Design a protein around this ligand. Structure first.
Ligand SMILES: Cc1nc(C)c(-c2ccnc(Nc3cccc([N+](=O)[O-])c3)n2)s1
Length: 280
């Protein structure tokens, strides 16, 4: 760490505190995260998982039982950008560009059998060029109240062997939040989170999700709520956007759209790469 001069505390992530710092050797400005042999091996594998929509993991430093992760630095997270854009809304072409890029990032990681598992606006980073990138990819497999708002229903229902579909669910919740300027399912407990999902998408049953009633935390005593139309859930999103969202929010992880199939969705026929309005 003698090679890094800390600049400021930029955040407090799930796996540790994130600092902006300066590399004394290269003059590089980085994001330094201060966090078991299995963890070293898994983290080392993430250094090779390089994609333009993945925050680059520059180095892994294991010194005095402490673990530091050195990332490329981006100037803002999507949560702060969404707060800054709350009175006007993020323009739909920029929402579409960000969703398209994030789907490219997920399609890449998922093709390498790497899951994020904890996507949230707080770990989506943006730059002045119009790029958006996924941070903390693969850290959940290796290792303040942790937000449940973007948690897939199979996780809340006790599935211990969940799939890449959990990331599609989280990204669908973020897509809805960019469009409406409000969190889709802002639960403050696991049951509140599950019941918020049920109140909007309907209580799942064996018809829409075969095997759901046999899940570890499923209870036959769950209240039975009717599903709502997406026209009510995400106005003023057009029919292509609502169709894609509905496929990202299917209850059955096996029915849920893949990142690769989502990239071919008609919603992206007119996708562009606009420049965001960023104040740094
Ligand atoms: C949860 C995270 N894990 C990593 C690795 C993060 C990461 C990676 C690269 N650049 C940045 N920039 C940035 C800029 C402003 C504020 C914040 N914030 O932490 O609130 C972050 N963060 S954020």
């Amino acid at each position: 760490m003698e090679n890094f001069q800390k600049v400021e505390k930029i955040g407090e992530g799930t796996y540790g505190v994130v600092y902006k710092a300066r590399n004394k050797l290269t003059g590089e400005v980085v994001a330094l995260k201060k966090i078991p042999s299995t963890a070293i091996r898994e983290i080392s594998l993430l250094k090779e998982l390089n994609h333009p929509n993945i925050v680059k993991l520059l180095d892994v430093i294991h010194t005095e039982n402490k673990l530091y992760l050195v990332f490329e630095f981006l100037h803002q997270d999507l949560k702060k950008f969404m707060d800054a854009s709350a009175l006007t809304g993020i323009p739909l072409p920029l929402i579409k560009s960000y969703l398209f890029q994030l789907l490219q990032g997920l399609a890449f990681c998922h093709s390498h059998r790497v899951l994020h598992r904890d996507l949230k606006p707080q770990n989506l980073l943006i730059n002045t060029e119009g790029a958006i990138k996924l941070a903390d990819f693969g850290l959940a497999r290796a290792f303040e109240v942790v937000t449940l708002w973007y948690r897939a229903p199979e996780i809340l229902l006790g599935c211990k062997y969940y799939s890449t579909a959990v990331d599609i669910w989280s990204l669908g919740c973020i897509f809805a939040e960019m469009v409406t300027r409000r969190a889709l399912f802002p639960g403050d407990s696991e049951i509140d989170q599950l019941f918020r999902i049920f109140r909007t998408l309907g209580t799942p049953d064996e018809v829409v999700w075969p095997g759901v009633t046999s899940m570890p935390d499923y209870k036959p005593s769950f209240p039975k709520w009717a599903r709502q139309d997406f026209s009510k859930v995400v106005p003023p999103l057009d029919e292509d956007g609502r169709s894609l969202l509905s496929q990202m929010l299917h209850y059955d992880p096996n029915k849920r759209i893949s990142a690769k199939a989502a990239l071919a969705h008609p919603f992206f026929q007119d996708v562009t790469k606009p420049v965001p309005h960023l104040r740094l």
